[PDB]
Amino acid sequence: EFPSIPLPINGPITNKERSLAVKYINFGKTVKDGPFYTGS
Amino acid sequence: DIEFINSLLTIVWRFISENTFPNGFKNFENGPKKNVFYAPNVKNYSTTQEILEFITAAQVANVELTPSNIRSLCEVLVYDDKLEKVTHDCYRVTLESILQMFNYFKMFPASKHDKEVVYFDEW
Amino acid sequence: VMTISSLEQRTLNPDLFLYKELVKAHLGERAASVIGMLVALGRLSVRELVEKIDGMDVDSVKTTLVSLTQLRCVKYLQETAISGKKTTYYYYNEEGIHILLYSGLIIDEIITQMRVNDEEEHKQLVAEIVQNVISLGSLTVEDYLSSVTSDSMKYTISSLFVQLCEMGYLIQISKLHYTPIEDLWQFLYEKHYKNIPRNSPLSDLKKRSQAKMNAKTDFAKIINKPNELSQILTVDPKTSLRIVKPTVSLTINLDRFMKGRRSKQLINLAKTRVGSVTAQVYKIALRLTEQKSPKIRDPLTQTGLLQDLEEAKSFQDEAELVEEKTPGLTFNAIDLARHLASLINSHLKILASSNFPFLNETKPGVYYVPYSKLMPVLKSSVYEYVIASTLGPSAMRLSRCIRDNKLVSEKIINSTALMKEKDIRSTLASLIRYNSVEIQEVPRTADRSASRAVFLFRCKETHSYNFMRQNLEWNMANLLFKKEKLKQENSTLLKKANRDDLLPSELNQLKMVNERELNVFARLSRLLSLWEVFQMA
């Protein structure tokens, strides 16, 4: 597309931070499951 | 201009790196830098006309016998962007030795329907 | 056309789209509406929210404010007038939105903090304890321990509970923190002015003398209220174990959590300086000095700067006196550092003579880590490694050579490291674009033209720092909005994938979108670790 000027260094898949994303999504699921939802 | 400046830059950085630290313990971490300097001493010195001796020991036969102006110009050239520069050209340390070998950013980018370049765009 | 490059949300919303996307993925959609008007306006009452949302009623606005107050996403402030009519006012709380922002790094640092009891308790118990603390908000002990049936191991929570609030994170609840920063100073500034009787003028005011010392005094006492307090800690019953009082409820503190996260960038600078072992002894000497350090900017100069030259001068001077006089953080001796002889003392002398400003000011022989002289080097050493990483090393040369002197001129850059007229001008214009050149003109005519004028280039600070901070917040707002793009493509998949607790095209759909949902968090953690440095002074 239009952005072609170069990219930063925070994009490999050599991460070893797979536990942090699991903690993130489990926190998100426990907050979404909670009583203080008030959606739509 | 333009490639012999970089060649002289590479050899004076190599001479600084071999004057400060020994060369045999640079490629690996087997008790790094001889456990650096074996609890380092009060040596804290540098070239101080020794760099021009290493220049004079190997030159191209052109008119590059510069000293006292392009000396300080290359000195500024390695501290207007770069390493240590403490108390009139002492020990030159900090991260260029592992950069010649912010670290380890292999396999960038991806070419999917997804991320990179998405960044620096105008805004 | 085919607008696909994210243009219809490109420029229309920074600095509030982040706050609206952090709460849309956590607290529904009705909280996003009442949080998008507290930011876009500021102070507005209950009826003002009802007449400004245009689509919710008082039964809907007041319900969602409780769900924000429970996550401390809304500051309270009650006010009154000269005739009465006391009403309630609501501010947007950025600390609660930061709690919703990090949310897994809270339960990442707290796992890698405890001693020898490792990987038998700290995966099932405390990973649910702290997760229930952050999700539910303010938690008491008695209402929480009744969930488990036949609590045979009912003392196992107390050993992790008395230890964790002793050295940090857990703190007494927001009986002070819902109050704003401005009104806590302003109500304290007026009560020490009207309770002074009439006297001689003495340059016609004189009370601005007294009201600029003594109020600050008990303001510090208010600052002394969210710290380690012995009112809840070390309660001694007879013929039992040392236990804290489980009566009052307790929450987390986002003041000791940030100064422990600053230690990560300090360890990164130490690894930039020295390789393996000396960086490790600086690491352990900094981890032993966490909970007593001076913090990211106090509320004394967060607001209420009364234009005084002496206050703005000797506020950073009295912070040095706070740094010099600690009850034991200045005690950074050799055996104290090695307890958790001459070799690591030599490594600590290498720290003293490292000459970038960390571990300095050692006159009697006992060492100390300065912070206020470390913060510009911390904020600038990471700024020079982003342009060098993304834009180019020649751009870092051309940017840092502005900083070598003050205002290098155009016939002096081309004398340094590179010739003229080829790519110095393109790189310099690109750095004009990213607010790191700050051009200036001097004219040779009567109307300041462009032909008869020559230019002057000085890299002005706090314009490159604020723009990059806004850009990092912007791309954080990017990275969570594309996460909501896959939710519309999985609304008929994740809803149906709950009755199990082959159609192999779903194997290339369900298990294919998962790594695309995890790598955005794996990159968001690095966005966090790169953004924090511009909000720690």
CSV table of N, CA, C and O in Angstrom, one decimal, chain C residues 131-173:
chain,number,residue,atom,x,y,z
C,131,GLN,N,-4.8,-12.4,40.0
C,131,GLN,CA,-5.7,-12.2,38.9
C,131,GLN,C,-7.1,-11.8,39.4
C,131,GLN,O,-7.8,-11.0,38.8
C,132,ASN,N,-7.5,-12.3,40.6
C,132,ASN,CA,-8.8,-11.9,41.2
C,132,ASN,C,-8.6,-10.5,41.8
C,132,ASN,O,-9.6,-9.8,41.9
C,133,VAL,N,-7.4,-10.1,42.2
C,133,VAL,CA,-7.2,-8.8,42.7
C,133,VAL,C,-7.4,-7.8,41.6
C,133,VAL,O,-8.1,-6.8,41.8
C,134,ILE,N,-6.8,-8.0,40.5
C,134,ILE,CA,-6.8,-7.0,39.4
C,134,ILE,C,-8.2,-6.9,38.7
C,134,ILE,O,-8.7,-5.9,38.4
C,135,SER,N,-8.8,-8.1,38.6
C,135,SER,CA,-10.1,-8.1,37.9
C,135,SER,C,-11.2,-7.5,38.7
C,135,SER,O,-12.0,-6.7,38.2
C,136,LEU,N,-11.4,-8.0,40.0
C,136,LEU,CA,-12.5,-7.5,40.8
C,136,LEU,C,-12.2,-6.2,41.5
C,136,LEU,O,-13.2,-5.6,41.9
C,137,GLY,N,-11.0,-5.7,41.5
C,137,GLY,CA,-10.7,-4.4,42.1
C,137,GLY,C,-10.3,-4.4,43.5
C,137,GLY,O,-9.1,-4.8,43.8
C,138,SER,N,-11.1,-3.9,44.4
C,138,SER,CA,-10.8,-3.9,45.8
C,138,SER,C,-11.4,-5.1,46.5
C,138,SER,O,-12.6,-5.4,46.5
C,139,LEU,N,-10.5,-5.9,47.1
C,139,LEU,CA,-10.8,-7.2,47.7
C,139,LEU,C,-10.5,-7.3,49.2
C,139,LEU,O,-9.4,-6.8,49.6
C,140,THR,N,-11.4,-7.8,49.9
C,140,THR,CA,-11.2,-8.2,51.3
C,140,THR,C,-11.0,-9.7,51.4
C,140,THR,O,-11.1,-10.4,50.5
C,141,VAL,N,-10.6,-10.1,52.6
C,141,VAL,CA,-10.1,-11.5,52.8
C,141,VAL,C,-11.3,-12.4,53.1
C,141,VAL,O,-11.3,-13.5,52.6
C,142,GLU,N,-12.2,-12.0,53.9
C,142,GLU,CA,-13.3,-12.9,54.4
C,142,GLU,C,-14.3,-13.2,53.3
C,142,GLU,O,-14.8,-14.3,53.2
C,143,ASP,N,-14.6,-12.2,52.4
C,143,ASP,CA,-15.5,-12.5,51.3
C,143,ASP,C,-14.9,-13.3,50.2
C,143,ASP,O,-15.6,-13.8,49.3
C,144,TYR,N,-13.6,-13.5,50.2
C,144,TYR,CA,-12.9,-14.2,49.1
C,144,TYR,C,-12.6,-15.7,49.5
C,144,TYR,O,-12.7,-16.6,48.7
C,145,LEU,N,-12.3,-15.9,50.8
C,145,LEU,CA,-11.9,-17.2,51.3
C,145,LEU,C,-13.1,-18.2,51.4
C,145,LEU,O,-12.9,-19.4,51.6
C,146,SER,N,-14.3,-17.7,51.3
C,146,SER,CA,-15.5,-18.5,51.4
C,146,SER,C,-15.8,-19.2,50.1
C,146,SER,O,-16.8,-20.0,50.1
C,147,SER,N,-15.1,-19.0,49.1
C,147,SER,CA,-15.3,-19.6,47.8
C,147,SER,C,-14.9,-21.1,47.8
C,147,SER,O,-15.6,-22.0,47.3
C,148,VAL,N,-13.8,-21.4,48.5
C,148,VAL,CA,-13.3,-22.8,48.6
C,148,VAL,C,-14.1,-23.5,49.6
C,148,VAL,O,-14.5,-23.0,50.6
C,149,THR,N,-14.3,-24.8,49.3
C,149,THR,CA,-15.1,-25.7,50.2
C,149,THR,C,-14.1,-26.6,51.0
C,149,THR,O,-13.2,-27.2,50.3
C,150,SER,N,-14.3,-26.7,52.3
C,150,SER,CA,-13.4,-27.5,53.2
C,150,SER,C,-12.0,-27.1,53.1
C,150,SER,O,-11.1,-27.9,52.6
C,151,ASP,N,-11.7,-25.9,53.5
C,151,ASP,CA,-10.4,-25.3,53.4
C,151,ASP,C,-9.4,-25.9,54.4
C,151,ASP,O,-9.1,-25.3,55.4
C,152,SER,N,-8.9,-27.1,54.0
C,152,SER,CA,-7.9,-27.7,54.9
C,152,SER,C,-6.6,-26.9,54.8
C,152,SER,O,-5.9,-26.7,55.8
C,153,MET,N,-6.2,-26.5,53.6
C,153,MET,CA,-5.0,-25.6,53.4
C,153,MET,C,-5.5,-24.2,53.4
C,153,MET,O,-5.3,-23.5,52.4
C,154,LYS,N,-6.0,-23.7,54.5
C,154,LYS,CA,-6.5,-22.3,54.6
C,154,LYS,C,-5.4,-21.4,55.1
C,154,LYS,O,-5.6,-20.2,55.0
C,155,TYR,N,-4.3,-21.9,55.6
C,155,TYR,CA,-3.2,-21.1,56.0
C,155,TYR,C,-2.1,-20.9,54.9
C,155,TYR,O,-1.2,-20.1,55.1
C,156,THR,N,-2.3,-21.6,53.8
C,156,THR,CA,-1.3,-21.4,52.7
C,156,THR,C,-1.5,-20.1,52.0
C,156,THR,O,-0.5,-19.6,51.4
C,157,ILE,N,-2.7,-19.5,52.0
C,157,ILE,CA,-2.9,-18.2,51.4
C,157,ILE,C,-2.3,-17.1,52.3
C,157,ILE,O,-1.8,-16.1,51.8
C,158,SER,N,-2.3,-17.3,53.6
C,158,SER,CA,-1.8,-16.3,54.5
C,158,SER,C,-0.3,-16.1,54.5
C,158,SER,O,0.2,-15.0,54.7
C,159,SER,N,0.5,-17.2,54.2
C,159,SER,CA,1.9,-17.1,54.1
C,159,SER,C,2.3,-16.3,52.9
C,159,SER,O,3.3,-15.5,52.9
C,160,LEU,N,1.6,-16.4,51.8
C,160,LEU,CA,1.8,-15.6,50.6
C,160,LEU,C,1.2,-14.2,50.7
C,160,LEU,O,1.6,-13.3,50.0
C,161,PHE,N,0.3,-14.1,51.6
C,161,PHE,CA,-0.5,-12.8,51.8
C,161,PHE,C,0.3,-11.8,52.7
C,161,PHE,O,0.3,-10.6,52.4
C,162,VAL,N,0.9,-12.3,53.8
C,162,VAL,CA,1.6,-11.5,54.7
C,162,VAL,C,3.0,-11.1,54.1
C,162,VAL,O,3.6,-10.0,54.4
C,163,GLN,N,3.5,-11.9,53.2
C,163,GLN,CA,4.8,-11.6,52.6
C,163,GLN,C,4.7,-10.6,51.4
C,163,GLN,O,5.6,-9.8,51.2
C,164,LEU,N,3.6,-10.6,50.7
C,164,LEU,CA,3.5,-9.8,49.5
C,164,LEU,C,3.2,-8.4,49.8
C,164,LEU,O,3.6,-7.5,49.0
C,165,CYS,N,2.4,-8.1,50.8
C,165,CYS,CA,2.1,-6.7,51.2
C,165,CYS,C,3.2,-6.1,52.1
C,165,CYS,O,3.1,-4.9,52.4
C,166,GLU,N,4.1,-7.0,52.6
C,166,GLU,CA,5.2,-6.5,53.4
C,166,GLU,C,6.2,-5.7,52.6
C,166,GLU,O,6.8,-4.7,53.1
C,167,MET,N,6.5,-6.1,51.3
C,167,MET,CA,7.6,-5.6,50.5
C,167,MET,C,7.1,-4.9,49.2
C,167,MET,O,7.8,-4.8,48.3
C,168,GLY,N,5.8,-4.4,49.2
C,168,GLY,CA,5.3,-3.8,48.0
C,168,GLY,C,3.9,-3.8,47.7
C,168,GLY,O,3.0,-3.3,48.5
C,169,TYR,N,3.5,-4.4,46.6
C,169,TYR,CA,2.3,-4.3,45.7
C,169,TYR,C,1.0,-4.1,46.4
C,169,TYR,O,0.3,-3.1,46.1
C,170,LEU,N,0.6,-5.0,47.3
C,170,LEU,CA,-0.7,-4.8,48.0
C,170,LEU,C,-0.6,-3.7,49.0
C,170,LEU,O,0.3,-3.5,49.7
C,171,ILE,N,-1.7,-2.9,49.0
C,171,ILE,CA,-1.8,-1.7,49.7
C,171,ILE,C,-3.3,-1.4,50.1
C,171,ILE,O,-4.2,-2.1,49.7
C,172,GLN,N,-3.5,-0.5,51.1
C,172,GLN,CA,-4.8,-0.2,51.6
C,172,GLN,C,-5.6,0.5,50.4
C,172,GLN,O,-5.0,1.2,49.6
C,173,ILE,N,-6.9,0.3,50.4
C,173,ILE,CA,-7.7,0.7,49.3
C,173,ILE,C,-7.8,2.2,49.1
C,173,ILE,O,-7.4,3.0,50.0
